[PDB]
Structures are given as structure tokens and as C-alpha cells.
A paper describes a structure:
To identify features differentiating the ligand-binding pockets of human and fungal BET BDs, we determined crystal structures for CaBdf1 BD1 and BD2. These structures exhibit the canonical BD fold (comprising helices Z,A,B and C, with the ZA and BC loops defining the ligand-binding pocket) and closely resemble those of their human BET counterparts (mean pairwise root-mean-square deviations (RMSDs) ≤1.5 Å; Supplementary Table 3). The ligand-binding loops are structurally well conserved, including nearly all water molecules implicated in ligand recognition, although the overall binding surfaces are less negatively charged in CaBdf1. Superimposing the CaBdf1 BD structures onto that of JQ1-bound Brd4 BD1 reveals no major steric clashes between JQ1 and the fungal BDs. However, whereas JQ1 fits snugly into the Brd4-binding pocket, the fit with the CaBdf1-binding pockets is poor. Replacement of Brd4 residue Leu94 by a Val or Ile residue further contributes to the poor fit. In addition, the p-chlorophenyl group of JQ1 occupies a groove in Brd4, which is absent (BD1) or shallower (BD2) in CaBdf1 (asterisks in Fig. 4c). More generally, recognition of the four BETi compounds by human BET BDs involves 16 residues, including the eight signature residues previously used to classify human BD-binding sites. Five of these residues in BD1 and four in BD2 are invariant across human BET proteins but diverge in CaBdf1 (magenta arrows in Fig. 5), including the WPF-shelf Trp residue and the Leu residue opposite this shelf, at signature positions 1 and 3, respectively. Remarkably, nearly all of these residues have shorter side chains in CaBdf1 than in the human BET proteins, implying that selective CaBdf1 inhibition could conceivably be achieved via small molecules that clash sterically with the human, but not fungal, side chains. Nevertheless, an inhibitor that targets both CaBdf1 BDs without inhibiting human BET BDs is in principle achievable, because the WPF-shelf Trp residue at signature position 3 in human BET BDs is bulkier than the corresponding (Val and Phe) residues in both CaBdf1 BD1 and BD2.
BET proteins are chromatin-associated factors that regulate transcription and chromatin remodelling. BET proteins bind chromatin through their two BDs (BD1 and BD2), which specifically recognize histones acetylated on lysine residues. The BDs from C. albicans Bdf1 (CaBdf1) share 31–46% sequence identity with human BET BDs and 58–66% identity with those from ScBdf1 and hence are likely to bind multi-acetylated H3 and H4 tails. In conclusion, Bdf1 BDs are required for the viability and virulence of C. albicans and can be selectively targeted by small-molecule inhibitors without compromising human BET BD function.
Numbering used by the authors: 383 to 490
Write the structure that this text describes.
């Protein structure tokens, strides 16, 4: 697993993305996609791997990431999956870009 200092930073980062400070645009990403509610039955077979912020937090807590780059890859996957299913200009697409910008600022 990643070193202690990077683990702390990644924990802070995922908590930031999930924070109530961003409640108006992180809600689509906190938990697994509701494929029934969204009428996207083949979602899991289309995306490379499904992912959500809560699962990233749980994977981090179980020491699943070898380094912080691997943590970043899962964050990017959340947003890649967003844009694959939500066209540019739509509400959820824009929320994804806004939350990804929060990540980019923290990660820079």
C-alpha cells in the first residue's frame, strides 16, 4: 500500500470530494450508479469498471491502492464514466466537471 503521508493526503482528498460543501454537485457520484432508476441496464458492461466516491474511500481504507497515482486513476474513472453517459451541457455532465475541478485544484 501507499506510504503513510500519501495515504493521509488521499484520505483528505476523498473526504473533500464527498463533503457537504459540494452537496449540490457531488450527489450523483457518492454511491453506485442507480442503473434501474436511470434506465441504463448495461452500464456495468459498457464502462471499463464502475466506480463511485464512497467505494474509493472504502478501497483506500482497506489499503487497496499501491500509490497515490492509483487512487487518482479511480477518481478519474468516476468522471470518465460520467461523461460517457452524460452529454456535454447536461446537468450531470456539468456537475461532474465541477467536482473534477475541485479534485484538480486539490491534486495540483
Amino acid at each position: 500500500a501507499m506510504g503513510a503521508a500519501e495515504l493521509r493526503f488521499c484520505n483528505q482528498t476523498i473526504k473533500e470530494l464527498m463533503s457537504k460543501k459540494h452537496y449540490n454537485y457531488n450527489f450523483p457520484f457518492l454511491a453506485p450508479v442507480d442503473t434501474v432508476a436511470l434506465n441504463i441496464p448495461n452500464y456495468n458492461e459498457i464502462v471499463k469498471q464502475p466506480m463511485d466516491l464512497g467505494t474509493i474511500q472504502s478501497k483506500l481504507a482497506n489499503n487497496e491502492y499501491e500509490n497515490a497515482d492509483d487512487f487518482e486513476k479511480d477518481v478519474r474513472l468516476v468522471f470518465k464514466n460520467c461523461y460517457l453517459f452524460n452529454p456535454e451541457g447536461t446537468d450531470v455532465n456539468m456537475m461532474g466537471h465541477r467536482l473534477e475541478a475541485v479534485f484538480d485544484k486539490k491534486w495540483a
